[PDB]
């Protein structure tokens, strides 16, 4: 019956501002209020700020008074969250909501805020890199009965995606693609690595970082 | 309510109940709102006011109240239960709304298994380049929680070095990994560097050394 449609990821520059929408299909606004709140890479929810779109006057948390702005449009039926002045701590996922306030008042008369509805969620990403191509480099064997380890380090790529096949696809034997590590250069950084038998086979890795339109084969020489 | 507390993480087994509490000022007047959220999807409301589910949501989840603390009870704690749960309530001099620092519910689906690590020295072809990484893989432990610390000569080492939070789809077993960047000098300075994966209470640990 209700949702609610937030706008597509953004990577924004640290000095620049974005400006997160939220549309409402079916319900109207009404008295109900759209709430923005955010999520930090691995920290917890942060509640940003709240609007009551037919009154049409917003209140801000303690620290975002002066930076966010909460706006609320009833001829889109679309709500908008404005912040300014962008920096690496404000990389995160900013959620819209639609908070309820309610009353029970049997007994003593006890409050209730829950949101039912929320937005699929904003990602913001601040950094100040460009888009770079990847540098691929070769982890080595070195001398359990064989299993030999043996992978490529993708180092200093800022666009997200990234992918690895060993010999063109072709090689499947225990070939794990950890997530990228984001070092201080604002710049990911993957490993691919596969085990085989110590014995001859040719072990060549590609990888394809498709945002910089980049495709590097390597081949991981033994010592 | 000016701030809301709760455990940072909780453990369970399969089919134990588990019981995430939330502790605030002003939980007497307002009732606690709970949230379930998984990694890389928004929050969905498990819980309001008083037997107040939502629909859908299955019947393990129940609120209860005593006074200024809220506490969310799951009965079944099912492998898809694992998540981070959030209690959220209304602040009542200012409209401001407060959010608990979030439990992270991990349900003990499958048995322990050891972490298998394996440290890859600066490649020679990447010191053409005047830098080094030491790359140490974690890989198939479970619980999912492990702590990476890294060492050179008998020294922890504490600046660049970047741990990757672990996460693993082939199976329940859980991977990882950490960088440790620095330059030739520094690698070629110290006789050996060390990466020391603890788990659980066990930590393994593989040195490497210029040769």
């Known amino acids: 019956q209700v949702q609610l449609v937030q706008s597509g990821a953004e990577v924004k520059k ?45 209140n801000y948390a ?15 039926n679309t709500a908008y969250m404005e912040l300014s002045s962008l920096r690496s701590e404000d990389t995160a996922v900013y959620f819209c909501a639609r908070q309820i306030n309610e ?85 990911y950084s993957l490993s691919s690595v596969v085990t085989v038998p110590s014995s001859t086979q040719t072990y060549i890795c590609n990888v394809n970082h498709k945002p910089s339109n980049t495709k590097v084969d390597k081949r991981v020489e033994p010592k | 309510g000016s701030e809301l507390t709760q455990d940072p993480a909780v453990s369970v087994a399969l089919g134990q109940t588990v019981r995430i509490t939330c502790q605030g000022d002003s939980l007497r007047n307002y009732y606690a709102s709970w949230y379930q959220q998984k990694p890389r999807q928004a929050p969905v409301l498990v819980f309001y006011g008083k037997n107040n589910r939502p629909s859908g949501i299955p019947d393990r989840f129940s ?16 492998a898809e239960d694992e998540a981070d749960y959030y209690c959220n ?18 349900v003990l689906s499958q048995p322990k298994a050891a972490p298998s690590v394996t440290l890859f020295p600066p490649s020679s072809e990447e010191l053409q380049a005047n830098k080094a990484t030491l790359v140490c893989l974690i890989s198939d432990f479970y619980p999912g929680a ?15 070095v970047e741990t990757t939070t672990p996460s693993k789809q082939s199976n329940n077993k859980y991977a990882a990994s950490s960088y440790l960047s620095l330059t030739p000098e520094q690698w070629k300075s110290h006789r050996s560097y060390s990466c020391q994966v603890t788990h659980e209470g066990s930590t393994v640990e593989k040195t490497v050394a210029p040769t």
């Open chain 1, 14 to 58: 640290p000095g620049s501002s974005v400006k997160v929408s939220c549309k409402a299909s079916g319900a109207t606004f009404g008295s109900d209020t759209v709430t923005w709140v955010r999520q930090a890479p691995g920290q917890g929810l942060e509640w940003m700020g709240g609007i009551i779109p037919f009154f049409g006057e917003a």
């Open chain 1, 62 to 76: 303690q620290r975002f008074q002066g930076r966010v702005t909460i706006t609320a449009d009833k001829s889109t």
């Open chain 1, 103 to 187: 009353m029970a008042t049997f007994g003593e008369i006890h409050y209730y805020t829950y949101m039912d509805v929320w937005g699929q969620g904003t990602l913001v990403t601040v950094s100040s890199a460009s888009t770079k191509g990847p540098s691929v480099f070769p982890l080595a064997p070195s001398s359990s009965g064989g299993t030999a380890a043996l992978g490529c380090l993708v180092k200093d790529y800022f666009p997200e995606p990234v992918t690895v096949s060993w010999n063109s696809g072709a090689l499947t034997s225990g070939v794990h693609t950890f997530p990228a590590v984001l070092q201080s250069s604002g710049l």
């Open chain 2, 63 to 78: 609120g209860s109240s005593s006074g200024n603390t809220a506490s969310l009870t799951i009965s079944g704690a099912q």
């Open chain 2, 89 to 106: 309530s209304r602040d009542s001099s200012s409209n401001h709304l407060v959010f608990g620092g979030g439990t992270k519910l991990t």
């Open chain 2, 146 to 160: 492990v702590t990476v610390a890294w060492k050179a000569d008998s020294s922890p080492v504490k600046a660049g």
